[PDB]
Design a protein around this ligand. Structure first.
Ligand code: CA
Ligand code: CA
Ligand code: MG
Ligand code: MG
Ligand code: MG
Ligand code: MG
Lengths: 339, 339, 339, 339
């Protein structure tokens, strides 16, 4: 019933990466042929789906693992630039229906800062979406986290442009994959490993003071917060009543609840559960929750039939469905934006 | 107000390991001197606390990381035997207040099976409590998981004795620690890493068919299920609607909800949140939730004041507080067991 | 697709009361012709609905206001006897699909007790269902309540036979209707007036000591408890911390939560809300919640599609759907009872 | 330890009505002497409580049953004028701690509108608080409801001044008390009768079109909405899917959820339940929930210790504790308003 919804965990892939798309689809799709067409399509099938399910605006982003899988910094940077140029041309076809997040190589803070700036200033991109850590090292076995002082120049750019950063998952790779996941591989992705990566990274940003140095910074997590709201009580207790008396306070000046009120957002991507949504409204607050889908790994029908029909007060259905995002991303009018 | 409560995530340490106890306390306690005395005491301070807070019975278990930190199999086995002999003598002082879980070396399935059998048949231990994977390899960088066919002999022993297995966390070590945790070390333990280990292991047991080969097996998780109930909807969706059409059904014959109804238990250790408890009652069911404390990392006061005073229907307060555990562990009478 | 569900707020009417049936339908049905057919049918339409929606067993009862609308005691008693004899003959056609509640005139405690006893002993009825207070007095403007010593012989018959009593609503009538409802007539029935009557009556039983004199007595309320769970905290507070220091304790010896654990049941009739069900699971406990429909005022489709597909743990879906009622009504078998 | 909280179901009585005050206290207080002192005090005991419990601002109102108990219209109106003049003088001593609601005789719409207007324009009162229906008729056994066209001039005055109307309960009286309550008298007041009256009246305003004729009108209910949120699903179902196909749509143009998003507020007075608050956050939305106490029938300690320490996200703690009310009542400053 609700129209003008905004979705913002919505992936695309370059047409020239069909092999990579099919490999990823072999893990996460039950219809590879349909998946290939849907993840590459922008302006036809995606619009048909959105027209049928009351989605007015979609903020598109590059599929995982995307650029974060690329450990050669020169190749990674060139791919990020290529993807951003590509999607900017695609969204120009229907700008009243689509915006985009920047795709970044995260090998170098200044390089990523400059490319984010290019995307926002040249193309009007709405923020950045990065698939967790950047693979690095001679054969990609290292990983680059962004929760340290080397990345201050990048987070300062996010706050200067006043745009959010969506911390999306990626698959485990290298030694981590071999040690923890190969022998229980069906847990890779949405069932468990994705959330383990994102929650580690975002709570690393918390405990390493990123939101203290950059109190304006907005970080978004999918999948109703990648487990974190479930342990809001336990994290807060073990911070305020334990670790904050042992040294954590030196690099973490506020409570986990403060950071969720001031800095962190969660979306409903891939987690179409009213019971869990209700629990998140208590632990995080409806003001900090955004509707999203996770297309094409999830269907518009599943996400939108769920949300349109969920038992929910009308105030929060409007906020989660579009008004929260309209404010956060400073959106102009779009289809059914005031319907 | 409720008396005769049962707690079963309650740790002790051997008096001769004071240095190890102090190191662990430097991470997880704000009063090392009191912690040292409390984790070694069995029959005096522990009883004073329990008498003040309506705890009739405690099932004791060895502190983490315990034997799972020991990668030399000969040393590990000898320590497990030592600990079990020690605690059996300690609980004989007040058997109406204390039982114990077996402490095991998990280097070898048959060895662990035999020691569990010794503990149950000789000492009347109530089950096993193991701190996640067993460190192994020449310098302890390897880890032994129990979700495979080599461990069938061990899980068959659990079901033959009809006793549960409590999958407790341990700290990350070796390469995993260096790669994921050293640069965000305040997340080690209760704030995040503990739950990541246990949930991986237990969901590995699920997806590798342990509960299919051993449908009577009962596994217990602390900390309200180590995130898993939060993603019950998402795991079930990505199993039944995705991975089960891609190959998971070959080694996983039931739904995640079936396994929580038939095989898995959660406790309230270290997670004194009525809002989260309510959400777990919806996702898991009050019949599958056990009260516990996590002493001495948590206080009796915190856990028992919370639970005694939580808004809760009287049926579930009695079940979670003691009647669920009385049935699961086939308990004879104990202090206030019918009060 | 749970099978073998039990529903027990399921109404029929005598064919000879068509004019009265059409008047009730003019208030509470959008399709009077289908309503007349459905409320008078026992063994065809009703069975077809149950076959399509996984309902194995239904306990049938007489429509409201029913005998409680009849203020002439002789006419009322003869009608009750007629109804019970009638429904006994009809449910003989499908004893594995139907049981019945006794229909009673509640003008006289001994008369009602004798007729309940005849129904149970002669016909195997499962209990009694009564539409709130009995209309009485010259023109029916008086009300007979059952929460007093005159009714002890009746409550004792319920506990002796060990069958429950379903306190169903009826419409407001006479001076009460004129004074409170006529100027806001769209609130009559399920929107408000029904719950106001039942909660008054049942909380009257509580505060007048009925469950103290008859501790084994089981009372069932529909519609998730007619508001009472919403105020569980508030009622308990204003009893234990206020009124029970001013005189209530003289006739009310347990807490409201005690009575919901020991004496009171709620059903899901006409209240197909998972959010509200979850809240009742917290305030009342899943052990004390029964599935029901409220057919034909509600459809099988609405009730069963909601419950079959509600997000709920498997343990509580089985209990609420059938196992709670199977135990309460001592059902050893019926269609799909162990499906 | 949230400071600057706003409470607004906070009662006073005139010193000259001591006998009436002691009678009300005999029903609803366990300490009559303290009650008399607290309900008549404005500027000493009340301020001390607020200083100790983080309440910056209180909107005071006259005790129930108040002017609504007075069936002589001339006496009732003179009493209202007296009360408003009185409380205006008392709150001048602490304008950064107190505002007031108008006390009204509701015998005549124009008379009430004129007195509300005098209170707002002359004294800066914040709205009106009325104890349900106005007693009227020879011996006060009649009731005046406000959900009809006669009261349009009054509702228009509320929207013109842009101030809300608090529908507070009163005791049942006369024939209604005798017929429904006298034989179960411990249910009178907070346990049940209060909510039955207020929900009847407010849902009467809904179904008689008051919010359609006056879409800007704001109505406040105490006690987490007097049961209505519990039946949000059921009311909405029986309106939109039943009664609105039989005639309700002629005088009721929006859904019940619409009216709770646009016109109706609930407060936490006398209902210090986080479980129930969470449920109301789902059914009503945190934006429409206001903190309040119900002093001196409830203590500051109970209300404020509950709310200050409730598990709640930080965003909603600030909104419910003060920011919602700050916006509704256009408060630019008061003690600790931005603390
Ligand atoms: Ca006919
Ligand atoms: Ca005096
Ligand atoms: Mg995604
Ligand atoms: Mg522990
Ligand atoms: Mg019914
Ligand atoms: Mg009040």
């Amino acid at each position: 019933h609700m129209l003008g919804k905004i979705a913002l965990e919505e992936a695309f892939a370059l047409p020239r990466f069909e092999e990579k798309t099919r490999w990823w689809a072999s893990l996460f799709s039950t219809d590879a042929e349909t998946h290939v067409k849907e993840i590459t399509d922008i302006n036809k099938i995606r619009i048909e789906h959105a027209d049928k399910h009351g989605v007015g605006y979609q903020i598109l982003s590059y599929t995982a693992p995307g650029v974060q899988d690329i450990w050669d910094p020169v190749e990674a940077q060139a791919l990020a630039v290529e993807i951003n140029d590509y999607i900017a041309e695609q969204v120009r076809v229907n700008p009243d229906r689509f915006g985009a997040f920047a795709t970044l190589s995260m090998h170098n803070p200044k390089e990523a800062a400059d490319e984010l700036r290019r995307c926002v200033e040249k193309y009007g991109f709405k923020g950045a979406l990065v698939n967790d850590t950047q693979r690095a090292g001679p054969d990609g076995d290292d990983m680059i986290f962004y929760d340290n002082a080397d990345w201050d120049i990048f987070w300062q750019t996010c706050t200067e442009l006043d745009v959010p950063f969506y911390m999306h998952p990626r698959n485990p790779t290298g030694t981590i994959y071999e040690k923890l996941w190969a022998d229980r591989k069906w847990l890779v992705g949405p069932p468990l490993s994705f959330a383990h990566g994102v929650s580690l990274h975002v709570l690393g940003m918390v405990t390493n003071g990123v939101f203290d140095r950059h109190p304006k910074l907005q970080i978004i997590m999918g999948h109703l917060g990648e487990h974190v709201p479930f342990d809001m009580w336990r994290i807060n207790h073990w911070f305020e009543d334990r670790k904050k008396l042992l040294g954590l306070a030196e690099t973490c000046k506020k409570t986990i609840r403060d950071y969720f009120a001031e800095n962190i957002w969660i979306t409903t991507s891939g987690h179409f559960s009213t019971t869990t949504l209700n629990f998140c409204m208590a632990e995080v607050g409806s003001d900090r929750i955004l509707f999203s889908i996770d297309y094409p790994f999830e269907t518009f029908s599943d996400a939108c039939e769920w949300f349109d029909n969920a038992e929910l007060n009308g105030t929060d259905r409007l906020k989660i469905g579009r008004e929260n995002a309209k404010k956060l991303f400073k959106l102009d009018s779009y289809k059914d934006s005031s319907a």
